[PDB]
Design an enzyme around this catalytic site. Sequence first.
Site, PDB file in Angstrom:
ATOM      1  N   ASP A 251       2.866  17.241  13.316  1.00 33.67           N
ATOM      2  CA  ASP A 251       2.392  16.566  12.108  1.00 33.67           C
ATOM      3  C   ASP A 251       0.924  16.230  12.333  1.00 33.67           C
ATOM      4  O   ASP A 251       0.611  15.377  13.166  1.00 33.67           O
ATOM      5  CB  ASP A 251       3.207  15.307  11.816  1.00 33.67           C
ATOM      6  CG  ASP A 251       2.969  14.760  10.415  1.00 33.67           C
ATOM      7  OD1 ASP A 251       1.867  14.236  10.150  1.00 33.67           O
ATOM      8  OD2 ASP A 251       3.891  14.854   9.578  1.00 33.67           O
TER       9      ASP A 251
ATOM     10  N   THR B 129       6.360   7.606   0.742  1.00 32.97           N
ATOM     11  CA  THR B 129       7.388   7.510  -0.288  1.00 32.97           C
ATOM     12  C   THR B 129       8.782   7.445   0.325  1.00 32.97           C
ATOM     13  O   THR B 129       9.655   6.724  -0.172  1.00 32.97           O
ATOM     14  CB  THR B 129       7.277   8.695  -1.248  1.00 32.97           C
ATOM     15  OG1 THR B 129       7.664   9.896  -0.571  1.00 32.97           O
ATOM     16  CG2 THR B 129       5.845   8.838  -1.742  1.00 32.97           C
ATOM     17  N   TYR B 130       9.009   8.203   1.403  1.00 29.43           N
ATOM     18  CA  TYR B 130      10.296   8.172   2.092  1.00 29.43           C
ATOM     19  C   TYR B 130      10.515   6.835   2.794  1.00 29.43           C
ATOM     20  O   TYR B 130      11.636   6.314   2.818  1.00 29.43           O
ATOM     21  CB  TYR B 130      10.389   9.339   3.086  1.00 29.43           C
ATOM     22  CG  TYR B 130       9.380   9.304   4.222  1.00 29.43           C
ATOM     23  CD1 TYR B 130       8.090   9.800   4.055  1.00 29.43           C
ATOM     24  CD2 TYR B 130       9.725   8.782   5.465  1.00 29.43           C
ATOM     25  CE1 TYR B 130       7.171   9.765   5.087  1.00 29.43           C
ATOM     26  CE2 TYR B 130       8.811   8.741   6.502  1.00 29.43           C
ATOM     27  CZ  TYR B 130       7.537   9.236   6.309  1.00 29.43           C
ATOM     28  OH  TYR B 130       6.632   9.199   7.345  1.00 29.43           O
TER      29      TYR B 130
ATOM     30  N   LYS C 256       8.465   2.999   3.070  1.00 32.09           N
ATOM     31  CA  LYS C 256       7.353   2.279   2.471  1.00 32.09           C
ATOM     32  C   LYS C 256       6.521   1.570   3.533  1.00 32.09           C
ATOM     33  O   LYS C 256       7.021   1.194   4.599  1.00 32.09           O
ATOM     34  CB  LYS C 256       7.881   1.282   1.442  1.00 32.09           C
ATOM     35  CG  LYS C 256       8.963   1.871   0.543  1.00 32.09           C
ATOM     36  CD  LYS C 256       9.531   0.849  -0.424  1.00 32.09           C
ATOM     37  CE  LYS C 256       8.617   0.645  -1.619  1.00 32.09           C
ATOM     38  NZ  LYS C 256       9.186  -0.329  -2.594  1.00 32.09           N
TER      39      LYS C 256
ATOM     40  N   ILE D 264       0.862  -1.175   0.000  1.00 28.03           N
ATOM     41  CA  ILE D 264       0.000   0.000   0.000  1.00 28.03           C
ATOM     42  C   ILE D 264       0.901   1.229   0.000  1.00 28.03           C
ATOM     43  O   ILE D 264       1.725   1.413   0.904  1.00 28.03           O
ATOM     44  CB  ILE D 264      -0.974  -0.010   1.192  1.00 28.03           C
ATOM     45  CG1 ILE D 264      -1.520   1.392   1.462  1.00 28.03           C
ATOM     46  CG2 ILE D 264      -0.330  -0.631   2.424  1.00 28.03           C
ATOM     47  CD1 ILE D 264      -2.480   1.458   2.616  1.00 28.03           C
ATOM     48  N   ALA D 265       0.778   2.054  -1.039  1.00 31.94           N
ATOM     49  CA  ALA D 265       1.678   3.188  -1.237  1.00 31.94           C
ATOM     50  C   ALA D 265       1.235   4.383  -0.392  1.00 31.94           C
ATOM     51  O   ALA D 265       0.546   5.294  -0.846  1.00 31.94           O
ATOM     52  CB  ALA D 265       1.752   3.552  -2.715  1.00 31.94           C
ATOM     53  N   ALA D 266       1.647   4.360   0.872  1.00 29.95           N
ATOM     54  CA  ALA D 266       1.388   5.468   1.778  1.00 29.95           C
ATOM     55  C   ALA D 266       2.575   6.415   1.894  1.00 29.95           C
ATOM     56  O   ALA D 266       2.443   7.611   1.619  1.00 29.95           O
ATOM     57  CB  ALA D 266       1.002   4.937   3.164  1.00 29.95           C
TER      58      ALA D 266
END
Lengths: 290, 357, 487, 876
Positions: free
Chosen positions: B157, B38-39, B41, B34-36
């Site tokens: 954040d 990018t920095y 995985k 699941i591509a949550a």
Amino acid sequence: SGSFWTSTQRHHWQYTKASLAKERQKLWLLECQLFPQGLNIVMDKNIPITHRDLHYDKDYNLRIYCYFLIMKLGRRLNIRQYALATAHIYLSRFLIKASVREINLYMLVTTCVYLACKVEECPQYIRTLVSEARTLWPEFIPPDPTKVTEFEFYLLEELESYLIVHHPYQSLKQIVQVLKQPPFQITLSSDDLQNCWSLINDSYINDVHLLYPPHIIAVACLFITISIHGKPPKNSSSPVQIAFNRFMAESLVDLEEVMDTIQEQITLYDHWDKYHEQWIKFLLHTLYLR
Amino acid sequence: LMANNDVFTIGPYRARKDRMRVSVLEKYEVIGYIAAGTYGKVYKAKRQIKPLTVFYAIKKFKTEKLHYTGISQSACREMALCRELHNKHLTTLVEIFLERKCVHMVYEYAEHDLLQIIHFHSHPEKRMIPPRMVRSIMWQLLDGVSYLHQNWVLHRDLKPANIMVTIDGCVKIGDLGLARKFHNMLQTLYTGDKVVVTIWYRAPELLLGARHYTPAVDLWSVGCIFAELIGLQPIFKGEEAKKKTVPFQVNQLQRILEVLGTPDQKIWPYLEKYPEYDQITKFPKYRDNLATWYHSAGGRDKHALSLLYHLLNYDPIKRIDAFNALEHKYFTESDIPVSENVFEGLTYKYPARRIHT
Amino acid sequence: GSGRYLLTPPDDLHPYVPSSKPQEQVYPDFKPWEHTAAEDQILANFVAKGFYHTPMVNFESISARSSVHESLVTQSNILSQQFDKIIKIREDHINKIPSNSTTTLHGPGFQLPNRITLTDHRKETWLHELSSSHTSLVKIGKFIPHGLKRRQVIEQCYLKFIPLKRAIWLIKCCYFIEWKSNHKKKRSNAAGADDAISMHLLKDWTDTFVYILEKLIFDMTNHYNDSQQLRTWKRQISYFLKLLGNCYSLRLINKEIFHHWLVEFINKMENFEFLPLSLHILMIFWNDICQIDQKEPFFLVTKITDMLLHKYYIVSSSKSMINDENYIINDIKKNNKIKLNILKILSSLILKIFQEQSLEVFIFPTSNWEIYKPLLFEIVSNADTNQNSDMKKKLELISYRNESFSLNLGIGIVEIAHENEQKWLIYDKKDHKYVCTFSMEPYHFISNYNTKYTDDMATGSNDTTAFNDSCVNLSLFDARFERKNPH
Amino acid sequence: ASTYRLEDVLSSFYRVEKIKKINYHQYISKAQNDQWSIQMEFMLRKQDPKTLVALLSRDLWCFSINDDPVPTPPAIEHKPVSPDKIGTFTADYSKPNLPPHYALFLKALRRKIYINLALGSHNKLIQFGNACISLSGVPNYLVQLEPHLFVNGDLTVSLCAKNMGLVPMKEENLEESFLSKHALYLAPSGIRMHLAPASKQGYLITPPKHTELLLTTLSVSHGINLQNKKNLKWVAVVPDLGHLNGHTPTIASYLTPLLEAKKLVWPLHLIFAQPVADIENSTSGDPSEFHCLQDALDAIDDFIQLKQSSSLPFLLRHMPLASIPDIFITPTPVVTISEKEQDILDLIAEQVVTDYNILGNLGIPKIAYRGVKDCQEGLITTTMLQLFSTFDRLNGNDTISKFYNMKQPYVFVKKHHELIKVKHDSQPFIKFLNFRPPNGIKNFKSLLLSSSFKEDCLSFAPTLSQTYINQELGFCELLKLTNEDPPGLMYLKAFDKNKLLLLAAQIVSYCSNNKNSIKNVPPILIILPLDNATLTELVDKANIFQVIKNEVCAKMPNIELYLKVIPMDFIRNVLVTVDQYVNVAISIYNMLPPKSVKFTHIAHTLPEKVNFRTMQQSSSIIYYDSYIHLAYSRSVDKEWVFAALSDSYGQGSMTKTWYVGNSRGKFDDACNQIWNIALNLASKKFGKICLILTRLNGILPDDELMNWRRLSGRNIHLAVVCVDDNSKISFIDEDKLYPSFKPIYKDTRFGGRMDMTRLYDYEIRDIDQDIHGIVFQHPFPLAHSQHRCAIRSGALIKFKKCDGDTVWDKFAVNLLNCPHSDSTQLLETILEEFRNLAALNVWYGLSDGEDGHIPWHILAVKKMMNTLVHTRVKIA
């Protein structure tokens, strides 16, 4: 000092004395089958060999040298006391679960200072860190910082992600805040406050922080300072002493732990006499640079 | 006399450690990427052995995107904070596993995020969220940020991406990416971070470059979360910016001005002590249209208006903290009760996560 | 709300100053974040500069080796004596339960269960409430009506089948409330008029107990016509004998009037249909009547053997029926079957009389030497010559017949000296000497239920007045509290 | 305020000499002489009975007191014999194990004293072996003279008076009524023997002409020569050779004949007997069943119905009187075990070691040394003042060094929900304070199982369950089956195989019914009533419970039931208070499967003096952190081994028994398992830990010492301790002023004052639990086993609650092997631990308030070796 109760220090480390003795016995039975040979010590050829327990284990003789070398790297790099205290806590929590006759001590010290400075929000870059570790010790440290950071990786592996630790200094600040109240109305002189801070700074040796909460260590060092300032006719004169006795009694911070901490400070200052740099430095030299 | 890269080091202690380990191929197994992040995985972890299917999540911090780069600050602070902080409203960190190169954290897998709720409501049927669900989610998120506040740890954040929900409707604010314990700042915040929470949700102290930002920036982020949830659009959907170490976000300040209005010395007491207060003087002077912007939404007036007044105030002395915001005429006065389970009465599955197999 | 908030409280933790006002006392090693004034003053005065606090003491990071040098030899005993003073202050003031009462040797608190002015309806239901086996103890112990005469208490106790421990509690409670009332209404306090009241009360309760036992034993023959009433009566006499023994072993009955009444009651009876139960009542206290180790001394032994020989003669005289007023009086076989049993019982009792008494003074001043005892002693032991020689010396005495060379060891062995019966004494810890015998009368030791400690601990400070309530003050054992800051 | 007048408390040590030198000649038995030493010893004694002489098996030892030279024996007309070694010594020998010349000087002095005492009297007193019993029955006890030499040279004699039942027998006892139930003994030696069967004459024969020469030898040893007596009755005897070598026969089954060596002739004037102590059910409470109230209701129901050179091993060797038992009972029941199954003996020890006195000490009472008050009048003072220099007893101030009153230890108890400490003198108030155990609750389900009288156990079982529930000690939801039986009961009759099998089937059907539950809810126990409080029925009820467990376990495992016994009298005595069942309830609470956690333990308070351990003084002192106490014992016959293990606060208790038997492999196995359990408890504490093993009953022989020296090492530091319970040394107290319960016991009005209830800070201090510690100035001899003295003797001493001069109870501790230096500090630490372990023994159900001076594990071992050696075992 958010909340020491229901933290991770009160739960997953800081075991009692029997559990620490059992873990040290498991460490001893682990290193038993590693090398029954010993150590080939040579100076005048001369080659006797120790039994497995004559010394260079984790009893007493190298801990003072360990604290001295951590503090030397600290005041060379000029970082604050909380980072060196957390580095000493990582040092003790790593040497509990691993031996010292197989791990390069100076890289472990520089690694612990690195990890504690990174995790207590006062960072030091690896270039200046390994350059200071080279300019103080021109031996026992490779120029590659990658070996230092692989030591950092395995140090993060061993103490399994329990990085943050409450300190006795915050509870000392809270005690000296609450001693300025109408029940007591006392305050120390700034030289004895520095003496109590130095005793707290000195008590990170001698294996006490893995057993008791830090406010007990703060109360023990403050009691030693106050009762050693008060006397230098009636017996318990100078009623700063009297107000401190009523504070320690009327508050239910318990005894029989402060007794062990004061006795441990006494035996630390007893073991500081029969301590010399020569034999332990030469033992490190013949344990690594044979 | 000097040393090389062959001296006696950690080498033997590797061997005694490397015979007995546990791997990610042993305790768990993979399902789908699941591509949550990018920095770093994110993957889904089936438990390796009514049906109790896969409900775990792995974050694998492979920073090389070689030979052993060290841990980053964004990984060290996360590993320091997430392992010991624990609540009903946080993701539970199950285990750390340290592979041949990097770190693998395993938390619990969540059903969906708030961004998936806004994207479900981004179809042009416009299912405007009922006020009971959004006020219960607001109560639960404010209790979670209350627990995160009172234990002396900031939270820089707060995006609708990394705020989760689950079956039984329990909000978990599940990303301590840039948190820090601010009890004893040996080095101050501007000397340690120099940039903060993302462009669409930062605070006017941060937009005006404050060097000692107070813990109320999470409250501004929570108010932006709620304005996003009440308008189905990010409230200041800002425009990004390009020897000065800041790009100043010179359009985001224009947006937050023309939505809320200008400050002066009477709604902000010490803005004259700021580094670049004169750089705020190069905009026009808007009044406000805050009540109008709430008027261009659903008709649940008279109590969300006061809360959005109090949260979206750039007076960082008179902003409203969490436990004094958990009673602000929204949860005591009720027509349907604010529960823990937010999915009562609403009977639809906001569909499952897009798993790139 | 739905779930409870995170207020981050402590668990069970003692603050640094309990004397302080309860909302501004700092718990040890415990500090949550709170919005206050100095924080916003820091935020106002420290923008555009960055805020960080350098520590208070100059010259941190230095070992105290040349700062506190001789902390071993010259300076350890002062630390030991100061910590001894702290330990002594702790154990003597902070944890020791203070006895704040200057009247009696009970704890503060311990009130008797209060008498209420009750009529017969609620009391009639309350005695039925006691009679079950599932009811509570606190709610029943919170009240007890007054005016309860001892005849009615013992009567409804053995009539409504109250369990033994609750019955002993009720009887002891009536004892204690009557003793406290009669010690209240005393005009004159002379030496002797403040102690004999207890002996008066004990004699009075012994009197009503033997009255109720006589009443039940005569109610046997005054009721026996229904076998469902007899089946009730058998467990009735068994339960009353159990209760009488449980009261007699607790020193709640004056043992010397009861035995004299008992020997009078076995002497005065004339119909044999009370004998097998009354002789069993005699056999119960047989270990205390004949075991006393004209003449006051050993009077019940000689009285009991004269009475038992007289009862042996009267039983061996004639038939078992005494009325002879109704028809078909006697069939001979059941009559002899009944009489042989009573003869066996009296024979065994006279045998144990003759085995027991080493003094052996059977001088009979009333009826001089009627002979039945050789007919007894021929039967047992097959002519054992010790009883025979004692019987010949008996026939000499009681029938009133008309007219070492050098083995001196000198080792002088000691003898067994009898110890007294008061174990519990009292230490006077001031003058360091024993002073007096602790002895409460046995109607003082009541299991107290009327308390008021159903609240929580640490209610304010030093709430030991509602804690030390029992029928002994807790400071007579040095009852130390235990409370620590846990880890 | 210990203002005890240390002068004028009378001891039992009569000082008889003053020694600064003692000389000796040892003549070795060179070249295997033709009994030359055995001849020449009596040839030397015939000249004068004042000489000091003794003999190992053929070696000769002549001795001499301070100044006078040693005698030389009458040699041949030419003298080739020279002495083998000359020497001298003093009063500082090797103390923890005696060198073999002091242990011969003591035997020579004791033999000289008994021979001179027999000759000075009118031929009426012989040496029985460490005794002097009269031939007539004038004292009817054994007088025992025990010499000893202290460390400053004070040669003293201690007097003892053992009240054994040794009665002399004559010609008018040689019938079945006496020889069937007595144990005979040869008088000037001490061996036991049985009479040989007759020779058609009536158990007496005429003496042969040779063996009358033996009577001439009785003029030279033991000095009782009855050659002038015109009548002398001879008999034929045969002894047991095992008792010639220390192996006393099996005390469980005494009076049984065994193989012979050869017949012998012996004068009947000196052969003694020991009587079989007997046991009966009870008295005073109608054992012919009229105390049964249903007999009275039966009689009133009937009224209702009617209303319509072959003797020198017997003249030389001696037995030290510890190898003859004090008592041995008649019925002697039989238990059975396997070669792997030791369950019934551990069951009987488990259910006799922790019941107060409700069992009643079912056997025969003890035979203890009665204390001597004075000896000024008689003949032994004349013979000692004739024989030696002086004769007067040692005061208190010469032997006692340290006298001090012990403290009162505290204990944990839960009042409402606080966890408070309290003094240990507050056990019988445990109901009247609502005290509740700190260590949580234990729960069970009960099943009374009676067969005698159902109408009283019906009233007994619910009130016991109700007094167990009514204090917060768990829930005893008593058992309930389908039928008309009232719950927790099964009134059977004729306890046998078929009914126990059906009852086991019923219980296993109940357990198959109640399937799904927690593990800790179902432990069950069976209460059995002893119809007679003796041993023969306790072992039978143990057999019945073992049959039930065997039939239950094979049909279903993992079920865990237990056994509790209660005497029938305590059920059907109507004088049993309901303030007493509470104690019985605690005696269930110390048997539930959390076995080593009991009602309460010592409070572990703060110390009185802090005393921070800096630099020492730097000798080999240790300053230990956690002691471990262990008490093992071995019976007089060499079979049984008993053991009890306890922490320094009474925490990790174990009590076990091992029937070794005749062999010596099981003995080494049990002595290995004792150290196994000790190290298993030792692997729980800090470190620098010193286990203290205490051998009971004085004697510490060489085989156990070889075992404990083989097993020990650097794993732990041991410290051997010898413990003596019976007052063989008898300090008799004589003062009227110090112990301040004596003015209150003299007239009950001397102190008698009011409490002054504004000074109200007092404490109820129960006497019989106020122990005083003594540390003696010099080491003492052990009460048995003359081969090893002690170092740093001490004692716990408990007064008698009475007024005037009487002996006080004592508990003698003797250190034998200290690990470090400064043994006095170790002895005071041992006494300060022993006082706490003595005060614990009332809270555990080990005994009632009768001995607050004995520590609890030693009392447990003493109860086991008092009431468990009498059963005889068969291996099948």
